[PDB]
Design a protein around this ligand. Structure first.
Ligand SMILES: NC(=O)C1=CN([C@@H]2O[C@H](COP(=O)(O)OP(=O)(O)OC[C@H]3O[C@@H](n4cnc5c(N)ncnc54)[C@H](OP(=O)(O)O)[C@@H]3O)[C@@H](O)[C@H]2O)C=CC1
Ligand SMILES: NC(=O)C1=CN([C@@H]2O[C@H](COP(=O)(O)OP(=O)(O)OC[C@H]3O[C@@H](n4cnc5c(N)ncnc54)[C@H](OP(=O)(O)O)[C@@H]3O)[C@@H](O)[C@H]2O)C=CC1
Ligand SMILES: CN(Cc1cnc2nc(N)nc(N)c2n1)c1ccc(C(=O)N[C@@H](CCC(=O)O)C(=O)O)cc1
Ligand SMILES: CN(Cc1cnc2nc(N)nc(N)c2n1)c1ccc(C(=O)N[C@@H](CCC(=O)O)C(=O)O)cc1
Ligand SMILES: N#Cc1ccc(C(=O)O)c(NC(=O)c2ccc(Cc3c[nH]c4nc(N)[nH]c(=O)c34)cc2)c1
Ligand SMILES: N#Cc1ccc(C(=O)O)c(NC(=O)c2ccc(Cc3c[nH]c4nc(N)[nH]c(=O)c34)cc2)c1
Ligand SMILES: O=c1[nH]c(=O)n([C@H]2C[C@H](O)[C@@H](COP(=O)(O)O)O2)cc1F
Ligand SMILES: O=c1[nH]c(=O)n([C@H]2C[C@H](O)[C@@H](COP(=O)(O)O)O2)cc1F
Lengths: 506, 506
C-alpha cells in the first residue's frame, strides 16, 4: 500500500492534453516539473514507477527515463525482459501489483494518455493529482484529461508562470476520505472581547472563502484580492458614506502581485481592460477633459462628471465633463493654477511624471521615486479627490521595476480590479520607457469597502475558482510614454469567467 | 499517563508571584484565564486536578473550585474524605497517582506556590507552562516563580493586554524531547529561479529569526518589527545610496500594531521616548528650527542640519539648523512660500492638521482624513525629503481612531521604532482632541533597509525575546493639540532591554 499520483498537463478550459500523437505546446519548465516530481523519492535504494499507455510510450521515443521504471500498458507489446527499466502489463489493474509485492517501488505515477487517466480515475486508484493548467484554448485537441471527480479537492495552486508568452499554473488535488495554541487563543478571545485585536481581524468563514479546500497553498496572487473580499465580508463594519449606498468597510489592508511572469488581471470576472488602458493613457497625457473618454466609448467618469453631480457638489460654473485638476493634472502640472479643461498648461506646474522617468533611468537606487496626487490646495476644485493617492517606484538590482501604491479608498467591487490592472500597466510602461523589466506590485489600502448592492455579485465571484493570469505585451517600443496606443497592447491567454454587472455609486 | 501543565502569573523581570500570602496585583482577566484553562477538558465525565500547596490553599479561602478537584500538598492537613472536591497528599510525588490510576482525571494542573513549582520542575513532572507575564517590577515580592529550565521552549506569546494601566502577556512553554505541498513548492523553486516570487520573499533562516521556537504563535505585535528585520536580513539586496553607508534593502512591507490595550514601544531595546515626543510636538507646532530640539537636548536632526551637510546638498545659503519646509511645515502651512525659520507663517499655507481635526470630529465616517508631507514644489528647499510621506485616519463604529502611514524609506535600525512610537502618540493625541479612543496603527513601507553598520547591533536585538508593551497615558485633557508637554505623558510599565547604540548615516 503506497501512494499513487496522476501527473498531467491540460488546457485551462477544455482539459486538452494532446494532438496528433504529441503535445499541443512546448513548455520546458513543465517537463522539468514532471522530471522532478517523478524522481521525488525518500529511499535511495528504491525507484518510482511511471505508468503510461502505449501511444504515450511511443510519444517519448520508446526510450527509458533515467532512475525510474516505466510501466507500459498495452495488449500487443511483447512482454520483454531485456530492458529492466521498462515492463509491460496487459491491463491497468494488473500493473498495480507494485502495491502488493515489489517492495523496491516507492511511489506510483499515472502519467499515460486519456485512456489510462480515465480508468485510473474510474477504478479509484488515484490518491493525488499534479495538474499543470495551460492557458491555450483556441487550438486543436484530440486527447483530453477527464473531468476531475467530486471526490478530489484542490489543496494547492501556484503562481502563474510564463513560457514563450504562454501562461500556466501548478495545482495539487487530493482525494478526500498543536491544538493547545488554538485553544489558548480561543479562550483569550472569549475573555477579551474586541479588546483582542485578533477578534477584529477574524479569519473568514468557509462559506465566504474562495476555494476553501486550498488552505496552505493559496499561492496564486489572485487570492490576494479574493481573500480581501472575504475579509471585508467577515469583519466589515456597516457604515454610511457620501452616497446613498452604504458599505461594509475595514481599514488597513494590502495586496501583492507578481508582474514578472504574469499580468494581474482578475480571471474570476471579465475585466474591461480597454477602458482601464484608456483611462491610464488619459492620465499620462495630462488630460482632465471628461469628454475625451466618452468619445472613446469609456463612460467610467460620466457619473462624477454630470451637470447634476457637479452642481450638487458646488461646481455648477464648471463645464459638463470638466472634472478639474485631478489624476494627470497633478501628475504633469502639480500646483498649477487650474482654469478650464480647454486651456494650455504646457510649462505650468511641476511635471512629476517626467522627473520620475528621468530619476528612474538616471538614479535608480534613489529612494524618492514618488508620484503624488494629493494636493490640499486643489482638493476643492476637484470633481472627486484622488483615491489612488500615492505611488512609489523601486529599481531592483536585476533591473526590474516594482511599484507600491497607497490608496485611501477602495471600492473592491469595481475600483479595485481597475486599480490593479491600471498600475500594472503603468509600471510596465515606465519599465519599457526606462529600460527595465516589470517587477512586483504592492497595493496598500486604507478604507477597503464593499457597497451593499454588490454583495450578491461579489459572493458569486467568490464561487469561481481562479484561472492563471494572462500575459500583457507591448507590440512596439515607444519613444515617449505618451505615445502608447490601445493597438500596441497584446493580451495573451485571458480566459476569464463571465462578466458580473455591478452598478457604481455616484 | 496524561498531561501536566504549570499555570502561573509572574512579573516580567524578577518573576514574583506573591507577597504576604496574596498576589501583588488584581487582574480579573488573569483569573478568568486561569478558570478557562483549568476547566478546559475533552471528556464531560471527567474532572481536572489542580495541585497546590497549603499556603496557596489558604490564599483561596480553603474553598473548592467549581467543576475541578483540588489537590493540596501538605504534611499537616488532615487527609479528609468529607469533601470529594478537595484531597490532601503528603508529598508532590504521591499526588501524581492521577497518572497511574484514577481514570476520571483528564489533565493535571500544577498551580501551587513557589515550593510546588520549584520541585515540580526539579522532579521533571511538568509538560507545559502557561505563563502570564505581568509588567510590575518596582514593588515588593516574597514568593517567586523559578527560572524556566532550558528543556522548555516558548511556542506562543499573545498580544499585550491592559488592566488598570497594567500591561500583561500570555505565553505557552512546551518541553522539548502536508509534506506534498512543501515538496511541490520546493521543486518549483528549484525550477524557476527568482522567477518564482516566493524565492524573492524567502522565509528567514532560524539563525536570524527572533525566538525561533515560537512558530505558530507570533501574536505579540512587536514581532511585526522583528520579523521585518529578519526578512530584510534574509532577502535584502546590497545597495548603495546617497550616503557613504550602503544598505540591505527590500521593497513593499507592512507592520500592524494594536493601540487599544498597549503602546507599541519596542521592548527589545530601550527607545528614547522623550526625543520621539519632542520631535512630534515640534512637528505639530509647525516648527522647522532645528535648534529648538537641540535646546531641549534632542540631537536627532543635527546631522541633516549642519553647515557641512547643508553646503553639500546645496543649501549653503541656509542658516545652521534651518531645515527648511519639512514635517510640520507642510502639516500647518502646505504650499506656503518658505523663507527662513525665523519668519512668521501664521496664516500662510494650508493648515492640514486643523482641517484634519475638524473633519475627524465633524465627519467621522469620511474617507479623506489625510495628512501629507510630499510637496514636489518644496522638495528642493528641504534639508531632507519626507520619509513618513502620507498618513490616513479612520474612525471605527465604536469610536476608535486608527491610523495608516505610508513611509517611502525606512531605516529599520533607527527611524522605524521612532516612527512607530511617534505615529502612535500622534494618533492618541488626535483621539483625545477629537474625543475618541486609540485604535490600530498600520505602517506601509517602500524601501525598508538596514544600514550595514547596524548589523552586529540588530542581530543582537534579535537575540532578545520580547516583553509586553508598556502603557502610555495622558495626565490631563488639553484644549488644543499644540498644548501637549512632556510632563503630561505617563509611561507605565516599560521594562526594556538595554539600549543599543547605532550611528546615523548623514
Ligand atoms: N499533456 C500530458 O500531460 C500528456 C499528454 N499525452 C498525449 O496524449 C496522447 C496520447 O494519449 P492517448 O491517445 O489516450 O493514448 P494512450 O497513451 O492512452 O495509449 C493508449 C494505448 O494504451 C493501451 N491501453 C489503453 N487502455 C488499455 C486497456 N484498458 N487495456 C489494455 N490496453 C490499454 C492500448 O495499447 P495497445 O493498442 O497496444 O493495446 C492503447 O492503444 C499523446 O498525444 C500524448 O502526447 C500523453 C501523456 C501526458
Ligand atoms: N501568581 C501566581 O500564579 C500564584 C501566586 N501564589 C502566591 O504565592 C504565595 C504562596 O506560595 P508559597 O509561599 O510558596 O506557599 P505554597 O503555596 O508553596 O505552600 C507551601 C506549603 O505546601 C506544603 N509543602 C510544600 N512543599 C512540600 C513538600 N515537599 N512536602 C510536603 N509538603 C509540602 C507545606 O505545607 P505544610 O507546612 O502544611 O506541610 C508548605 O508549607 C501566595 O502569596 C500566593 O498568593 C500562589 C499560587 C499562584
Ligand atoms: C509521458 N510524457 C508526456 C507528458 C508531457 N508533459 C507532461 N507534463 C505534465 N505536467 N505531466 C505529464 N504527465 C506530462 N506528460 C512525457 C514524459 C517524460 C518526458 C521527458 O522527456 N522527461 C524528461 C524531461 C527532462 C527535462 O526536460 O528536464 C525527464 O527526465 O523526466 C516527455 C514526455
Ligand atoms: C491559586 N490561586 C492563585 C493564583 C492567582 N492567579 C493565577 N494566575 C495564573 N495565570 N495562574 C495561576 N496558577 C494563578 N494562581 C487562585 C486560583 C483560583 C482563583 C479563583 O478565584 N478562580 C476562579 C475565577 C473566577 C473568575 O474570576 O471568573 C475560577 O473559576 O477558577 C483565585 C486564585
Ligand atoms: N464587474 C465589472 C465591470 C464591468 C465593466 C465596467 C466598465 O465601466 O467597463 C466596470 N467598471 C466601472 O463601472 C468603473 C470602474 C472604475 C471606476 C473609477 C471610479 C471613478 N469614480 C468612482 N467613484 C466610485 N464610487 N467608484 C469607482 O469605482 C470610481 C468607475 C467605474 C466594471
Ligand atoms: N538604538 C537606538 C537609539 C538611541 C538613541 C537615539 C537618540 O537620538 O536619542 C536614537 N535615535 C537616533 O539617532 C535617530 C532617530 C530618528 C531619526 C530621524 C531621522 C532624521 N534624519 C534621518 N536620516 C537618517 N539616515 N536616518 C534617520 O533615522 C533620520 C534620527 C536619529 C536611537
Ligand atoms: O480608483 C478608484 N478606486 C476606487 O475604489 N474608487 C472609489 C472608492 C469609493 O467608493 C469612491 C470614493 O468615495 P470617497 O471620495 O468618499 O472616498 O471611489 C474610486 C477610484 F477613482
Ligand atoms: O522618520 C524617518 N524615518 C526614516 O526611516 N528615516 C531614514 C530613512 C533613510 O535611511 C534616511 C533618508 O532616506 P533617503 O535617503 O531616501 O532621503 O532617513 C528618516 C526619518 F526622518
Amino acid at each position: 500500500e503506497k501512494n499513487v499520483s496522476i501527473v498531467v498537463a491540460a488546457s485551462v478550459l477544455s482539459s486538452g492534453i494532446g494532438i496528433n500523437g504529441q503535445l499541443p505546446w512546448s513548455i520546458s519548465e513543465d517537463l522539468k516539473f514532471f522530471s522532478k516530481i517523478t524522481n521525488n523519492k525518500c529511499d535511495s535504494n528504491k525507484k518510482n514507477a511511471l505508468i503510461m499507455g502505449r501511444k504515450t510510450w511511443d510519444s517519448i521515443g520508446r526510450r527509458p527515463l533515467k532512475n525510474r521504471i516505466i510501466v507500459v500498458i498495452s495488449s500487443s507489446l511483447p512482454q520483454d525482459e531485456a530492458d529492466p527499466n521498462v515492463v509491460v502489463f496487459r491491463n491497468l489493474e494488473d500493473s498495480i501489483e507494485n502495491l502488493m509485492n515489489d517492495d523496491s517501488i516507492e511511489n506510483i505515477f499515472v502519467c499515460g494518455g486519456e485512456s489510462i487517466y480515465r480508468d485510473a480515475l474510474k477504478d479509484n486508484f488515484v490518491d493525488r493529482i499534479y495538474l499543470t493548467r495551460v492557458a491555450l484554448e483556441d487550438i486543436e485537441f484530440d486527447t483530453y484529461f477527464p473531468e476531475i471527480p467530486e471526490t478530489f479537492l484542490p489543496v494547492y495552486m501556484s503562481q502563474t508562470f510564463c513560457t514563450k508568452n504562454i501562461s500556466y499554473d501548478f495545482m495539487i488535488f487530493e482525494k478526500q476520505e498543536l491544538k493547545s495554541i488554538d485553544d489558548t487563543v480561543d479562550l483569550l478571545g472569549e475573555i477579551f472581547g474586541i479588546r483582542k485585536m485578533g477578534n477584529r481581524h477574524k479569519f473568514p468563514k468557509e462559506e465566504i472563502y474562495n476555494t476553501p479546500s486550498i488552505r496552505f497553498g493559496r499561492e496564486h496572487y489572485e487570492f490576494q484580492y479574493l481573500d480581501l473580499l472575504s475579509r471585508v465580508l467577515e469583519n466589515g463594519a456597516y457604515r454610511e458614506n457620501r452616497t446613498g449606498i452604504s458599505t461594509y468597510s475595514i481599514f488597513g489592508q494590502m495586496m501583492r502581485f507578481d508582474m514578472r511572469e504574469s499580468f494581474p488581471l482578475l480571471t474570476t470576472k471579465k475585466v474591461a481592460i480597454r477602458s482601464i488602458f484608456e483611462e491610464l493613457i488619459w492620465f499620462i497625457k495630462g488630460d482632465t477633459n471628461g469628454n475625451h473618454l466618452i468619445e472613446k466609448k469609456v463612460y467610467i467618469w460620466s457619473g462624477n462628471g454630470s451637470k447634476e453631480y457637479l452642481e450638487r457638489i458646488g461646481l455648477g460654473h464648471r463645464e459638463e465633463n470638466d472634472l478639474g485638476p485631478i489624476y494627470g493634472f497633478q501628475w504633469r502640472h502639480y500646483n498649477g493654477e487650474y482654469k478650464t479643461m480647454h486651456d494650455d498648461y504646457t510649462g505650468v506646474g511641476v511635471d512629476q511624471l517626467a522627473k520620475l522617468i528621468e530619476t528612474l533611468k538616471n538614479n535608480p537606487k534613489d529612494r524618492r521615486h514618488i508620484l503624488t496626487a494629493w494636493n490640499p490646495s486643489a482638493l476643492s476644485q476637484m470633481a472627486l479627490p484622488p483615491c489612488h493617492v500615492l505611488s512609489q517606484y523601486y529599481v531592483t538590482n536585476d533591473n526590474c521595476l516594482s511599484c507600491n501604491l497607497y490608496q485611501r479608498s477602495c471600492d473592491l467591487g469595481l475600483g479595485s480590479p481597475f486599480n490593479i490592472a491600471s498600475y500594472a500597466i503603468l509600471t510596465m510602461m515606465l519599465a519599457q520607457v526606462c529600460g527595465y523589466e516589470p517587477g512586483e506590485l504592492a497595493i496598500f489600502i486604507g478604507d477597503a469597502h464593499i457597497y451593499e448592492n454588490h454583495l450578491t455579485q461579489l459572493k458569486e465571484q467568490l464561487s469561481r475558482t481562479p484561472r492563471p493570469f494572462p500575459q500583457l505585451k507591448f507590440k512596439r517600443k515607444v519613444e515617449n510614454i505618451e505615445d502608447f496606443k490601445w493597438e500596441d497592447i497584446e493580451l495573451i491567454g485571458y480566459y476569464p469567467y463571465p462578466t458580473i454587472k455591478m452598478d457604481m455609486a455616484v
